[PDB]
Write a protein that holds these residues in place. Structure first.
Motif, mmCIF file in Angstrom:
data_model
loop_
_atom_site.group_PDB
_atom_site.id
_atom_site.type_symbol
_atom_site.label_atom_id
_atom_site.label_comp_id
_atom_site.label_asym_id
_atom_site.label_seq_id
_atom_site.Cartn_x
_atom_site.Cartn_y
_atom_site.Cartn_z
ATOM 1 N N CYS A 23 45.158 6.548 45.052
ATOM 2 C CA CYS A 23 45.865 7.693 44.188
ATOM 3 C C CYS A 23 44.784 8.447 43.912
ATOM 4 C CB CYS A 23 46.641 6.947 43.350
ATOM 5 S SG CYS A 23 47.688 8.243 42.250
ATOM 6 N N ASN A 58 44.945 12.580 45.611
ATOM 7 C CA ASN A 58 45.531 13.675 44.294
ATOM 8 C C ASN A 58 44.473 14.243 43.744
ATOM 9 O OD1 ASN A 58 48.365 13.170 45.255
ATOM 10 N ND2 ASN A 58 47.638 10.866 44.816
ATOM 11 N N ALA A 100 49.567 7.071 37.506
ATOM 12 C CA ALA A 100 48.797 6.160 37.863
ATOM 13 C C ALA A 100 47.993 5.637 36.820
ATOM 14 C CB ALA A 100 47.874 6.518 38.992
ATOM 15 N N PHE A 115 54.998 3.820 43.300
ATOM 16 C CA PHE A 115 54.271 2.800 43.745
ATOM 17 C C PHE A 115 54.783 1.555 44.231
ATOM 18 C CE2 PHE A 115 51.952 5.442 40.687
ATOM 19 C CZ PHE A 115 51.158 6.036 41.500
ATOM 20 N N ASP A 124 50.423 -0.943 48.018
ATOM 21 C CA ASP A 124 51.154 -0.500 47.167
ATOM 22 C C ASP A 124 51.818 -1.792 46.616
ATOM 23 O OD1 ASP A 124 52.772 -0.992 49.836
ATOM 24 O OD2 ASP A 124 54.003 -1.396 48.240
#
Ligand SMILES: CCn1c2c(c(=O)[nH]c1=O)[C@H]1C(=C(C)N2)C(=O)OCc2ccccc2OCCCOc2ccccc21
Length: 127
Positions: free
Chosen positions: A95, A99, A109, A42, A65
């Motif tokens: 994220c 994912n 995360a 990140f 980010d």
């Protein structure tokens, strides 16, 4: 390149302010997450080339980010704390869109987000 231009970290026409809340977002919130063992995915824009993620920027159209956030804070880019908090939330939301639940990157995360929220809980009232 598979990678888009990264989000801007300065813009002369963007309106901006300094506030005690934005100062805390840099000194406490960003710093705490930046030094965490799970920060590294990140700390910079997602690099679809290096990471072999040719679909990333087909799915994620508002990338964000903590490298960008860090530079925005250092550059006094924000008008208020909410704009910065929104950038953190975009990063996390991206994220979880890209994912799958339970993936290693999602576990990372989730740990960062828990800590983010613990620090946000102590955000000072603006003054
Ligand atoms: C935050 C952006 N990001 C991201 C990832 C990811 O899977 N999803 C994401 O959203 C990648 C990733 C980053 C920096 N970032 C990364 O270093 O991979 C390395 C990699 C490069 C080349 C080929 C396969 C590779 O690893 C295979 C394992 C799956 O990858 C993981 C696993 C754990 C943590 C991160 C990731």
């Amino acid at each position: 390149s598979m990678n888009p231009p990264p989000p801007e970290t300065s813009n002369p026409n963007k309106p901006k302010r300094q506030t005690n809340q934005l100062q805390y977002l840099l000194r406490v919130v960003l710093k705490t997450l930046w030094k965490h063992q799970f920060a590294w995915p990140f700390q910079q824009p997602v690099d679809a080339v290096k990471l072999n993620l040719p679909d990333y920027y087909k799915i994620i159209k508002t990338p964000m980010d903590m490298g960008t956030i860090k530079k925005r804070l250092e550059n006094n880019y924000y008008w208020n704390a909410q704009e910065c908090i929104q950038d953190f939330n975009t990063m996390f939301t991206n994220c979880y869109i890209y994912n799958k639940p339970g993936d290693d990157i999602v576990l990372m995360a989730e740990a960062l987000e828990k800590l983010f929220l613990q620090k946000i809980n102590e955000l000072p009232t603006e003054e």
